[PDB]
Write a protein that binds this ligand. Structure first.
Ligand SMILES: CCC[C@H]1N(C(=O)c2cnccc2C(F)(F)F)CCC[C@@]1(Oc1csc(C(F)(F)F)c1)C(=O)N1CCN(c2ccccc2OCCCC(=O)O)CC1
Length: 95
């Protein structure tokens, strides 16, 4: 039913929802594009990167690390990022 992969509708699981809402997300249902956007807002506000290597997120002592299950990851490794995000949501229908 989704018009594109980025437009897949999802319901974040409770802790990922808590995380997204902490950075101004007002929804309960999001597109995958929106989840990436709000994760980005979270990383930027909490400064979860080293100014030296901006492509590496450091999250070992943060909820982001607990939910993704890693102490750090590369923003370039999209496959790994999708895998970690998917474990924290449920796919929903357009109704
Ligand atoms: C490039 C300028 C915005 C990104 N930014 C920096 O890269 C950046 C800047 N200055 C200092 C430090 C950083 C740091 F984030 F990398 F640590 C700042 C925040 C928004 C920003 O990055 C991320 C959003 S969600 C995310 C993460 F959880 F880590 F995976 C990273 C961003 O919105 N995206 C767009 C989404 N990307 C992504 C990631 C995974 C899969 C597919 C992706 O993309 C597909 C195509 C885009 C589309 O979804 O339609 C990753 C980058």
């Amino acid at each position: 039913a989704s018009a594109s992969e980025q437009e897949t509708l999802v319901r974040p699981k409770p802790l990922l929802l808590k995380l997204l809402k902490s950075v101004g997300a007002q929804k309960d249902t999001y597109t995958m594009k929106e989840v990436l956007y709000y994760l980005g807002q979270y990383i930027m506000t909490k400064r979860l990167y080293d100014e030296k290597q901006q492509h590496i997120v450091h999250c070992s002592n943060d909820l982001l690390g607990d939910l993704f299950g890693v102490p750090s990851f590369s923003v370039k490794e999209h496959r790994k990022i999708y895998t970690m995000i998917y474990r924290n949501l449920v796919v929903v229908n357009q109704q």
